[PDB]
Amino acid sequence: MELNSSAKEDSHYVGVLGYPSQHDPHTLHPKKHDSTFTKVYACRDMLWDHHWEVRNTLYAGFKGALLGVAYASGFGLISKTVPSIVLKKMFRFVRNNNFGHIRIMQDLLTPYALTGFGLGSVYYLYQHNVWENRSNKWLAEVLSNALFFQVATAVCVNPGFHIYGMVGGILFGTLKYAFYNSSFFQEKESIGSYTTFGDLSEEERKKQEYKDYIQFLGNYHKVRNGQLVDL
Amino acid sequence: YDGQWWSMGSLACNVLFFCTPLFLYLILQVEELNSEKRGGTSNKFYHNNAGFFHFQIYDNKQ
Amino acid sequence: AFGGFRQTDNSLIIDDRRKIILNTRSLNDFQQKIYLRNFFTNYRPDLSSYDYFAFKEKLRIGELFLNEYRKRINNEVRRAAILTPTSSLREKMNHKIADQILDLSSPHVRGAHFQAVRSWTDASKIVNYVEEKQTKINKYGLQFPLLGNMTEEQCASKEDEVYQRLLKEMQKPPKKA
Amino acid sequence: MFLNPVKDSEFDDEVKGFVPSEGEVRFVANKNKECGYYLQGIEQCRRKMVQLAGDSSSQFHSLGFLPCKRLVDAHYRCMTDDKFGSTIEEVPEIGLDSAQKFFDCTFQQLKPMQSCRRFFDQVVRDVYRANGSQLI
Amino acid sequence: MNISYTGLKLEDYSDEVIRKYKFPNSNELERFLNREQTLTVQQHKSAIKLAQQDFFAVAGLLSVGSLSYIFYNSVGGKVIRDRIRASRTKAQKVIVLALAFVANAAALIIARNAITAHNFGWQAA
Amino acid sequence: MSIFSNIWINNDLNSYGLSILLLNIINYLIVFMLILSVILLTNLSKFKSLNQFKEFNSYNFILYSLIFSLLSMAGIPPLLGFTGKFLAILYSSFKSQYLLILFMTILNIFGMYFYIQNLRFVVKKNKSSILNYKNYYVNINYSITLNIILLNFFNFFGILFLSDLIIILNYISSYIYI
Amino acid sequence: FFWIILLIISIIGIFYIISIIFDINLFKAFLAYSTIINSISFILLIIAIIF
Amino acid sequence: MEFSNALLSQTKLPGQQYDYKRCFQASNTHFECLDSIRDAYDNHHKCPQTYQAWQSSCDVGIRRYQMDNREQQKKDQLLYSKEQLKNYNAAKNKEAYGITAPKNLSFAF
Amino acid sequence: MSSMLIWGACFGLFTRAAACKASMIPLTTSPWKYPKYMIVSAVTFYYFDWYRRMALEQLCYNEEKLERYQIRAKLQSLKIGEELSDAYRESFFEHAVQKNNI
Amino acid sequence: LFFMCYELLLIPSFLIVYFVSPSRRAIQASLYFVIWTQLGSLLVLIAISYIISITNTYEFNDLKYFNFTNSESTIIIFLIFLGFGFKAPIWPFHYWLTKTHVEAPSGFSIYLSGFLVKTALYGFYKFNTSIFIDIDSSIFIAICIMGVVDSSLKMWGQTDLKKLVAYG
Amino acid sequence: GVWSNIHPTDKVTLSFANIGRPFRLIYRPEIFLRDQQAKFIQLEKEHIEKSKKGEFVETTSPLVLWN
Ligand SMILES: CCCCCCCCCCCCCCCCCC(=O)OC[C@H](COP(=O)([O-])OCC(O)COP(=O)([O-])OC[C@@H](COC(=O)CCCCCCCCCCCCCCCCC)OC(=O)CCCCCCCCCCCCCCCCC)OC(=O)CCCCCCCCCCCCCCCCC
Ligand SMILES: CCCCCCCCCCCCCCCCCC(=O)OC[C@H](COP(=O)([O-])OCC(O)COP(=O)([O-])OC[C@@H](COC(=O)CCCCCCCCCCCCCCCCC)OC(=O)CCCCCCCCCCCCCCCCC)OC(=O)CCCCCCCCCCCCCCCCC
Ligand SMILES: CCCCCCCCCCCCCCCCCC(=O)OC[C@H](COP(=O)([O-])OCC(O)COP(=O)([O-])OC[C@@H](COC(=O)CCCCCCCCCCCCCCCCC)OC(=O)CCCCCCCCCCCCCCCCC)OC(=O)CCCCCCCCCCCCCCCCC
Ligand SMILES: CCCCCCCCCCCCCCCCCC(=O)OC[C@H](COP(=O)([O-])OCC(O)COP(=O)([O-])OC[C@@H](COC(=O)CCCCCCCCCCCCCCCCC)OC(=O)CCCCCCCCCCCCCCCCC)OC(=O)CCCCCCCCCCCCCCCCC
Ligand SMILES: CCCCCCCCCCCCCCCCCC(=O)OC[C@H](COP(=O)([O-])OCC[N+](C)(C)C)OC(=O)CCCCCCCCCCCCCCCCC
Ligand SMILES: CCCCCCCCCCCCCCCCCC(=O)OC[C@H](COP(=O)([O-])OCC[N+](C)(C)C)OC(=O)CCCCCCCCCCCCCCCCC
Ligand SMILES: CCCCCCCCCCCCCCCCCC(=O)OC[C@H](COP(=O)([O-])OCC[N+](C)(C)C)OC(=O)CCCCCCCCCCCCCCCCC
Ligand SMILES: CCCCCCCCCCCCCCCC(=O)OC[C@H](COP(=O)(O)O)OC(=O)CCCCCCCCCCCCCCC
């Protein structure tokens, strides 16, 4: 399981290995002789185009809405207590209308779905238009998430919890830098791996590696300090 | 009650006191601009001594 | 044995000397040591540990020596003020003394500043100046009790050496022009 | 160290200091960091040979410090980047005097490696100053 | 381990190389082997013995002086102490006054002796 | 893991994290055993609320044994639990887990106060009577006191002898080929 | 697969107990929550090990 | 444990069993022949009959363990000697009583 | 100091004294338990001194095998496509051909 | 050994404050002292773990031959400064100091203020002079100056002599 | 003394300072290095033999090991 696999890909390494690259265009090119239906159906590649800002914003909004609906299903609705009269009226609606449960679910999940969609869209636009080309990636993530979650906790939950929102945002930014923008448990390269370029003979490479080993010996403290017994 | 601290006393003085650390940091950075452009002492952990502590006894044993 | 800390950056490293390409996140401990961490953190990394300790001590003594120059010129100005009346005092000061006072200003001598901001070249020059003074002193062996420690045999040998050197210098003829 | 004598000096001994080029300093520092193993090896092998054949009656007394020759040659090659010969004996005339001083420091006077590394680095610096663009 | 005299012949190496890698004088070899080029292990041992003896003397003298002073001048109030010392015999008064001072002064003198390097043979002129 | 002309060099001991985990488990069990032995030495019915920590305000041995056991559970440096916590943090740093170190520290400090706050309740107006009476006199068990004393000695001086325990645990874990 | 599940469980547990461990008023609850806190710490250590 | 040769060799079929006496007799014969050959690299083809007997008698996992152990033994024999190791261990144990003070103001590196 | 038997004897003596103090009984109670504790402590700590060194020796020997596991585990951990790369191809062939000496 | 000696000072001081302080508020003051100082102790412990795990050395002088990257160096300096400033009181981490000084034995307050806050300074000096740091110290200087300003401004409003001396 | 007589370093330093390093490296580092250099030893031996002979091999020249 990997998070944000496409972004953290070594194009050079995959190219030298021949491994398929996630940066391939992934596009459809219908022929001019093809049917009109085929030409129309080939337009779906715009739904895969990752450079379409509107598509990405709707994608982020859908993610946020799904998260909000899941939160409502799990914790939000069960924690919130509805008035007895309101419950009786909505149960009466279920009795008097077919599929009344669907409309009740729509009514209950509308707030969570809408707020989740708004948060997702705003967060995507915020992170993309701002902080996308900063120098210190960790600092950018921490500051952006801190500010965003401070505002989010002030608005959605309560203005009196904005400090906790900011602290949670700092924690979430650190976590995202650790396991979303970085590959700690998602390694796709062997540690110490490399590639060879240039017309260097195997003898020359072995000689250079012998020199590298001699240098590496100095890492050991005992040899550097000359504190070894005569074997 | 929550938020009483800002109102109590004088709001302007409370805000100034709250922002004092930011003012100090900004003054330090503006001062360090002068150091950078001139060549004088700058706010950094100078490392002239290669880890050699002040008047430390450096000896070896047979 | 020295180790390393896992890297997160996704940059590529091209080593032209070894003719290989690595990635920052994929480096092991030795590769990190070779490529990262190879920068210098002292004025004269070429010197050994003992040599750089001597260099550091000479640099500290040289800073103190420049401060001593400033203190001496200030004392000379006080002496001039006391000895010479205010009339002609500035006339006599507008000479070597005033130029030296200005030339020993803060950029050239660290009076009371926390750090004397010196490039490695400037530090090397200061150490060379201190070593030149040390060489001049040791020619005649003026550093036995102060700025040096020696045994009795060393002192006797140095006395004989200085005696021979002084005799040769006296016998040398005057420099022409 | 890093002091040049005054050619036209009123008195017998006068010295004027100089600062080596940043390229020379970088080269010496990098090569010392890479080849420091050989210098420690030279020290340890010098002590080992003295212990083994220091006594006059020892059978190998006539071969003293010859085993250190391989270490010295390896150190020279590492410091000079395998150029300018494969042995210390192949040192250029510019550094021959400093090489002789280093050998006297190490094997005849048996002075500390702190002292003799100065002369070895002087050999390397002489070669680097002579060539310049050849080593970098 | 390939660093050994085995297999080495003087014929292979040049005369200059042999002269370069020739053993120094026997005295020089002995000094290098014993690490006595500058100072002898016996000199180190003598210095250590003197240091330990000086520390023991200094610490014992300080302890004796401190305890004697405390016990002699910690008998009660001013009036009580004055009356006790007045009834004190002549020799007892002398010891009470002199013991603490002598112990402390001897400790301080032994401390000063080490830093003061008077026993240097170059005293002349 | 380094490669020099097809020669692998390994300066890392893989069977070390498991040894550290075993060490932490053993240290927690030892401290838990110490506190539970202190409890068992006394009357069990007295301790039923955090307020009842004052009931430990008994003669010096029990009082200070409880205090040091609570501190050790908290993770105060000189005591035994500190060794486990410090070695866990050291292994996390060795594995280059800065976020894990951050979360470990948050949990450690919160738990530290959780243990420490009971020292406030330990204070009692008078001396408690928590010992069972047998033959008209309080029953003090020499065997449990001796076991508590050995546990106290090891709790105080675990750092000194920890190298041997670490060697033994690494020896046990090295058999696992992971 | 285990790494992400362990991380999520550890984070949720820490943020859930940070407040609960200060709401108990019983000796048995104190002992149980000591065990729970140590369990979470050892789970974090296990994540570090499996890394 | 997927990478562990020992743990993988500990696996077996439900009805599989090992005749250790026969396997060790065959392995002893084959290794005696190999030692008589005394080559740097074990060339089993120089001992065809014993090699076939060893293959038949011993299981693949047992053979893998035996070959790895033989390689380790060859490396140790090339490197060290009994008297050398005895002297080195004695010197190291003697050193363990003393302290290892830092060497300040070094000359290398 | 150097004798583990003497160290254990001292440990047992101090343990007995501490037990008496903790129990609030006179230190002269049950005098026969002093030599008993000293002997038990000396023997157990002597055995542990032997056991720690035996465990250390066996651990050093086990690390030799663990190095073999690490080398082969590293090669099998290589990502798909890296086993024939220039950085691992020679080592992979060494472990797949030269060491295929069954 | 340096770090262990630094961390050993907690137990005796806590025991003195807990069992020797006459005032009843000393019970809570001791807990505040322990928690506030232990947070900084954990920070310094993290820094020491970073140094030891990365550099296996312990001689305090082998660090000359090992250079920490920029990220490692900045993390180490931040952790070291904050951790040692928890002990050596800095703004805003002086609430524990005020509480402990007010509610501690008058004889132990002398020892605390006089000495126990300077072991942190000594440790910070040692670590930061051993490590090479390539970061701007403006933030740390600002923190120190803010602490000075805060304490100086609050001096006036203290009618309690012990608390006034604590602010000094 | 006795408890530390196994290693010159103190027990606390042994327990904490050494994290993840092989006990073969902590104790008996000479054997660890020699095992690590096993093949380099024979390469150096072959280089010395060839150097005594007319041939001079530059590939293995850097391999001059003393520990
Ligand atoms: C397979 C397992 C399940 C089998 C069926 C159940 C039998 C097993 C039961 C045991 C299992 C656990 C049950 C727990 C019950 C919990 C309580 C409860 O809800 O029941 C109490 C409820 C009340 O009990 P009562 O008081 O006795 O009865 C009072 C009334 O008489 C009752 O009358 P009523 O009309 O009031 O109740 C009707 C009831 C049952 O529901 C129905 O009436 C039938 C619904 C059929 C599905 C309709 C959706 C479209 C399906 C398309 C399928 C093809 C897709 C192809 C895609 C191709 C792509 C290329 O309504 C609901 O459950 C409400 C939700 C129904 C809609 C679900 C929509 C899922 C997709 C949503 C996606 C996101 C949309 C975003 C917005 C998009 C806008 C454009 O009990 C019942 O009515 C009978 C049991 C019904 C259980 C339904 C459980 C939910 C699952 C529904 C189907 C999900 C399909 C998912 C795949 C397709 C996705 C598109
Ligand atoms: C960012 C660009 C900067 C450059 C541009 C130029 C500078 C522009 C700065 C802004 C100036 C105009 C806005 C200030 C309005 C007053 C503050 C405020 O809003 O708080 C609510 C305001 C204050 O509430 P409060 O403090 O709770 O009331 C206390 C009671 O009056 C009971 O009082 P009490 O009888 O107990 O006596 C206590 C009294 C007296 O207290 C004392 O004696 C103790 C000392 C107090 C501080 C005195 C100032 C010291 C110098 C400050 C330097 C700051 C440097 C760091 C910041 C640098 C930023 C660049 O405390 C006060 O001072 C309260 C009066 C308001 C604060 C006045 C002093 C601070 C104002 C901000 C100065 C910023 C200067 C920046 C440039 C610096 C040089 C580079 O509430 C009211 O409206 C009630 C009436 C208060 C008197 C108002 C007098 C007229 C002010 C102008 C009105 C027209 C403004 C039009 C604005 C148009 C859009 C921009
Ligand atoms: C009758 C026993 C006679 C013993 C005589 C001395 C012989 C050694 C002790 C042998 C005891 C064996 C049986 C266990 C009895 C204790 C447990 C018990 O249940 O007793 C109940 C028994 C009766 O019950 P109770 O008295 O009603 O209950 C009261 C409580 O026990 C509460 O009482 P407490 O508050 O007084 O308890 C002590 C308190 C506070 O105790 C301390 O703080 C101990 C301070 C010792 C003085 C020296 C400290 C020097 C530190 C310098 C920095 C080193 C840094 C090294 C790097 C790593 C970090 C350490 O708690 C702690 O110990 C926790 C902090 C531990 C800090 C770790 C310091 C390690 C130092 C290692 C030795 C270094 C030697 C260097 C010189 C030689 C070089 C070759 O208790 C007693 O009779 C009093 C026991 C008091 C502690 C005794 C030991 C203190 C003196 C140690 C001197 C030798 C150095 C230490 C090493 C010893 C060998 C490993
Ligand atoms: C750095 C962190 C370190 C953390 C350490 C954590 C643990 C520390 C505390 C516990 C340590 C064990 C203490 C001894 C056992 C408890 C009972 C006891 O002996 O006192 C009763 C008994 C009291 O006698 P009493 O008061 O006259 O009469 C009592 C009743 O009236 C009448 O008595 P009774 O007739 O009812 O019962 C008589 C029997 C009562 O004693 C018992 O029945 C023993 C109960 C414990 C059984 C488990 C012992 C396990 C020992 C191995 C290491 C693991 C220890 C784990 C401990 C915690 C486990 C939860 O007495 C004995 O025979 C005592 C023998 C004790 C030594 C047993 C050694 C077994 C070794 C088995 C494995 C060998 C290696 C296999 C390798 C295989 C390789 C393939 O003790 C004594 O007579 C002497 C007391 C004073 C000296 C005590 C010396 C203790 C030395 C402990 C060394 C620990 C290992 C080395 C240090 C490791 C870290 C560097
Ligand atoms: C476990 C570790 C915990 C870490 C704690 C992290 C602290 C989180 C603090 C959040 C503060 C609130 C969000 C700030 C968002 C803006 C950040 C920014 O602009 O910096 C981006 C830019 C992007 O920088 P960059 O990434 O291009 O370059 C980085 C440079 N180096 C590598 C040297 C670090 O960064 C900065 O210029 C500031 C960096 C330091 C942070 C300063 C925060 C200032 C907050 C107050 C702003 C006041 C505005 C005016 C109003 C004043 C009052 C009236
Ligand atoms: C009573 C007398 C009072 C006198 C005035 C006292 C001070 C008043 C406030 C001074 C503010 C100075 C601001 C400029 C300095 C910025 C330093 C810096 O680089 O920080 C970047 C910081 C981050 O710095 P950093 O430390 O990350 O930088 C990287 C490290 N270096 C630089 C070494 C490479 O980014 C910020 O967060 C800055 C936020 C600024 C928010 C807006 C401030 C506006 C202030 C306007 C003041 C009014 C006008 C001037 C009045 C006086 C005119 C004479
Ligand atoms: C060839 C072998 C020959 C062996 C011959 C047998 C030798 C026997 C030696 C016995 C020595 C007994 C010494 C008792 C000293 C009592 C001092 C005292 O008064 O203290 C009271 C004090 C006070 O006890 P208290 O609690 O009654 O206090 C009284 C004071 N008030 C009133 C205030 C309460 O307590 C003690 O110290 C006594 C208990 C500790 C006794 C420790 C004895 C250790 C014995 C070690 C023997 C080691 C032998 C090694 C042999 C090796 C052979 C290879
Ligand atoms: C108060 C006098 C101070 C004298 C100055 C030196 C003090 C040295 C430390 C002594 C500590 C107390 C004794 C410890 C005994 C012990 O168990 O000591 C045990 C250890 C034995 O160590 P080993 O077992 O390793 O050999 O003792 C020593 O190592 C040396 C002890 C000190 C030797 C000098 C003795 C001087 C005697 C002076 C007598 C006059 C004093 C007058 C005072 C008023």
Q: Provide DSSP, F14-70.
A: STTHHHHHHHHHHHHHHHHHHHHHHHHHS-GGG--SGGGGGGG--SHHHHHHHHHHH
State the closest ligand 3 atom to the C-alpha of I20, by its place in the atom list counted from 1. Answer: 23
Q: Considering only CA atoms, which of F151, F162, F159 is closest in space to residue F68?
A: F151
The Cα K51–Cα K45 span in angstroms is 10
Instruction: Measure CA of the first residue to CA of the last residue in chain H; give whole Å.
Output: 42
Q: Which residue has the tokens 């012949």?
A: E9
How many angstroms is it from F163 CA to the middle of ligand 1?
63
Nearest alpha carbon, ligand 3 atom 66: F156
Cβ contact F168:F17 at 8 Å: no
Nearest alpha carbon, ligand 4 atom 58: F30
Cβ contact J86:J42 at 8 Å: no
State the closest ligand 6 atom to the C-alpha of J136, by its place in the atom list counted from 1. Answer: 33
Cα torsion through A49, A52, A58, A61, rounded to 10: 100
Residues 16-45 on C with a CB inside 8 Å of A are 18-23, 25-31, 33-34
How many angstroms is it from A103 CA to the middle of ligand 1?
12
How many angstroms is it from I45 CA to the middle of ligand 7?
22
Q: Which residue has the tokens 């190999």?
A: H34
Alpha helix ranges (H) inside B9-61: 11-38
| Cross-chain CB nearest to C117 (options B40, B50, B58) | B40
The Cα F112–Cα G39 span in angstroms is 15
The Cα A37–Cα A15 span in angstroms is 36
- Min distance J110 CA to chain A CA atoms (Å): 37
Sorted by sequence, the CB contacts under 8 Å of residue C26 that are 6+ apart come out as A189, A190, A191, A192, A193, A194
Phi, psi of J93 (to 5 degrees): -90, 65
How many angstroms is it from J83 CA to the middle of ligand 8?
41
Are 3 or more Cβ–Cβ pairs between B and G shorter than 8 Å? no
Cβ within 8 Å, pair A193-I77: no
Which contiguous run of DSSP H or E holds residue A91? helix A84-96
Token readout for I36 is: 């008993």
- Min distance K42 CA to chain E CA atoms (Å): 9
The Cα H56–Cα H69 span in angstroms is 20
Mutate to test the interface with K, among E1, E5, E13 (most CBs of K within 10 A): E1
Cβ contact A65:A113 at 8 Å: yes
Cβ contact C93:C85 at 8 Å: no
Minimal-distance CA residue of chain B relative to E36: B62
Cβ contact K59:A206 at 8 Å: yes
Distances (CA, A) of D120 to D18, D75, D82: 19, 9, 16
Instruction: Measure CA of the first residue to CA of the last residue in chain D; give whole Å.
Output: 22
Q: Is K13 buried (19+), middle (13-18) or exposed (0-12) by CB count in 10 A?
A: middle
Q: Which residue has the tokens 């020249």?
A: K61
| Cross-chain CB nearest to E23 (options D64, D89, D109) | D64
The Cα E69–Cα B17 span in angstroms is 58
Nearest alpha carbon, ligand 8 atom 9: E56
Check pocket membership of E32 for ligand 8, CB cut-off 6 A: no
Token readout for C81 is: 């003020």
Mutate to test the interface with A, among J52, J61, J65 (most CBs of A within 10 A): J65
Cβ contact A11:A23 at 8 Å: yes
- Residues annotated within a binding site of A: 12
Residues 204-223 on A with a CB inside 8 Å of C are 208, 212, 215-216, 219-221
Read off the amino acid at residue J115.
Answer: F
State the closest ligand 7 atom to the C-alpha of I26, by its place in the atom list counted from 1. Answer: 26
| Cross-chain CB nearest to D63 (options E8, E28, E29) | E8
Q: Is the dihedral of CA D38, D43, D49, D52 positive or negative?
A: negative
Q: Which residue has the tokens 């002492």?
A: B41
Q: F150 and chain I: CB distance < 8 Å anywhere?
A: yes
Which chain K residues are closer than 8 Å to C3 by Cβ? 20
The Cα D126–Cα F138 span in angstroms is 90
DSSP state of C117: -
Alpha helix ranges (H) inside chain C: 29-35, 49-83, 89-93, 96-103, 120-140, 152-171
Distances (CA, A) of H43 to A230, H29, I97, I100: 36, 15, 13, 12
Residues 7-66 on H with a CB inside 8 Å of I are 42, 44, 55, 60, 63-64
Please tell me which chains touch J, using 3 or more CB pairs under 8 Å as the contact test: A, B, C, F, H, K
Token readout for F75 is: 């993770």
Sorted by sequence, the CB contacts under 8 Å of residue C147 that are 6+ apart come out as C134, C137
Cα torsion through G17, G21, G23, G29, rounded to 10: 120
The Cα E97–Cα K38 span in angstroms is 77
How many angstroms is it from H98 CA to the middle of ligand 3?
26
SS3 F125: coil
Q: Is J88 buried (19+), middle (13-18) or exposed (0-12) by CB count in 10 A?
A: buried
Cβ within 8 Å, pair F5-A206: yes
Cβ contact D75:D61 at 8 Å: no
> What's the Rg (C-alpha) of chain A?
28
Read off the amino acid at residue E6.
Answer: T
Q: Considering only CA atoms, which of D135, D83, D117, A212 is closest in space to residue C46?
A: D117
The Cα A111–Cα A68 span in angstroms is 9
Q: C120 and chain F: CB distance < 8 Å anywhere?
A: no
Cβ contact I86:A196 at 8 Å: yes
Give DSSP secondary structure letters for A63-86. Answer: HHHHHHHHHIIIIIHHHSPPPHHH
Minimal-distance CA residue of chain C relative to H107: C48
| Cross-chain CB nearest to C117 (options B39, B49, B52) | B39
| Cross-chain CB nearest to B50 (options C52, C115, C117) | C52
The Cα C126–Cα B34 span in angstroms is 26
How many angstroms is it from F122 CA to the middle of ligand 5?
45
Minimal-distance CA residue of chain C relative to A8: C10
Token readout for E112 is: 């000063």
Q: Identify the bridge partners of residue F2 per DSSP, sorted by sequence position.
A: F9
Q: Considering only CA atoms, which of H72, F52, K37, E61 is closest in space to residue A220?
A: K37
At residue F157's C-alpha, the angle toward residues F154 and F163, to 5°, is 95
The Cβ of residue F151 has, within 10 Å, a number of other Cβ atoms equal to 22
Q: Is B30 buried (19+), middle (13-18) or exposed (0-12) by CB count in 10 A?
A: exposed
- Cα A227 to its chain centre, rounded Å, is 51
For helices C120-140 and C49-83, give the axis angle rounded to 10 degrees.
Answer: 80
Count of alpha carbons within 13 Å of H106, Cβ hemisphere only?
Answer: 24
Sorted by sequence, the CB contacts under 8 Å of residue E98 that are 6+ apart come out as none
Beta strands in chain D (DSSP E): 3-5, 15-17
Q: Considering only CA atoms, which of A31, A65, A26 is closest in space to residue A46?
A: A26
How many angstroms is it from E57 CA to the middle of ligand 8?
12
Query: Which own/partner contact pairs does F122-126 have at CB distance under 8 Å and 24+ positions apart?
Result: F122/F53, F122/F54, F122/F56, F122/F57, F122/F63, F122/F66, F122/F67, F123/F54, F123/F57, F123/J27, F124/F54, F124/F55, F124/F57, F126/F57
Read off the amino acid at residue K19.
Answer: I
Check pocket membership of F61 for ligand 3, CB cut-off 6 A: yes
Check pocket membership of E76 for ligand 8, CB cut-off 6 A: no
Strand order through the sheet with A195-196: A195-196, C20-23, C12-15
Token readout for A58 is: 């709707």
The Cα F123–Cα J18 span in angstroms is 9
The Cα C43–Cα C66 span in angstroms is 19
Cβ contact E22:D107 at 8 Å: yes
Token readout for G5 is: 């599940």
The Cα F45–Cα F40 span in angstroms is 11
Which contiguous run of DSSP H or E holds residue H78? helix H60-79
Cβ contact F92:G48 at 8 Å: yes
State the closest ligand 3 atom to the C-alpha of F77, by its place in the atom list counted from 1. Answer: 59
State the closest ligand 6 atom to the C-alpha of B30, by its place in the atom list counted from 1. Answer: 15
Total residues found in chain F within this entry: 178
How many angstroms is it from A134 CA to the middle of ligand 6?
20
Distances (CA, A) of H5 to F14, F74, H44, I76: 16, 42, 22, 12
At residue A13's C-alpha, the angle toward residues A8 and A17, to 5°, is 130
Which contiguous run of DSSP H or E holds residue F138? strand F137-138
Which contiguous run of DSSP H or E holds residue F2? strand F2-3
Minimal-distance CA residue of chain I relative to A192: I87
- Min distance D38 CA to chain H CA atoms (Å): 9
Burial J38-74 (b: 16+ CB within 10 A, else e): bbbbbbbbbbbbbbbbbbbbbeebbbbbbbbbeebbe
Q: C50 and chain J: CB distance < 8 Å anywhere?
A: no
State the closest ligand 2 atom to the C-alpha of B11, by its place in the atom list counted from 1. Answer: 27
Distances (CA, A) of F35 to F58, F69, J45: 15, 6, 27
SS3 F9: strand
Minimal-distance CA residue of chain F relative to K22: F13
Give the method of determination.
cryo-EM
Cβ contact H90:K3 at 8 Å: no
- Cα G39 to its chain centre, rounded Å, is 5
E vs K, Cβ pairs < 8 A, gives 11
Q: Considering only CA atoms, which of F162, F173, F175 is closest in space to residue F21?
A: F173
Cβ within 8 Å, pair B49-J128: no
Which chain H residues are closer than 8 Å to A223 by Cβ? none
Token readout for K7 is: 């290693």
Q: Identify the bridge partners of residue A196 per DSSP, sorted by sequence position.
A: C20
Q: Considering only CA atoms, which of F140, F149, F178, F171 is closest in space to residue F65?
A: F149
- Min distance J68 CA to chain C CA atoms (Å): 6
The Cα C110–Cα C116 span in angstroms is 5
Q: Considering only CA atoms, which of C140, C126, C39 is closest in space to residue D2?
A: C126
Q: Is C117 buried (19+), middle (13-18) or exposed (0-12) by CB count in 10 A?
A: middle
DSSP state of A21: P
Cβ contact A120:A148 at 8 Å: no
Q: J148 and chain K: CB distance < 8 Å anywhere?
A: no
- Residues annotated within a binding site of A for Zn(2+): 12
Cβ contact J129:B49 at 8 Å: yes
Q: Tell me the resolution in Å.
A: 2.8
Q: Considering only CA atoms, which of D120, D63, D70, D66 is closest in space to residue D95?
A: D120
Q: Which residue has the tokens 């003497």?
A: I6
The Cα J98–Cα J151 span in angstroms is 11
The Cα I41–Cα I13 span in angstroms is 9
Quick one: three-class SS letters along A195-210? EECCCCCHHHHHHHHH
Sorted by sequence, the CB contacts under 8 Å of residue C1 that are 6+ apart come out as A219, A220, A221, F11, J56, K21, K25
Cβ within 8 Å, pair D114-H107: yes
- Cα D62 to its chain centre, rounded Å, is 24
State the closest ligand 1 atom to the C-alpha of A106, by its place in the atom list counted from 1. Answer: 77
DSSP state of C176: P
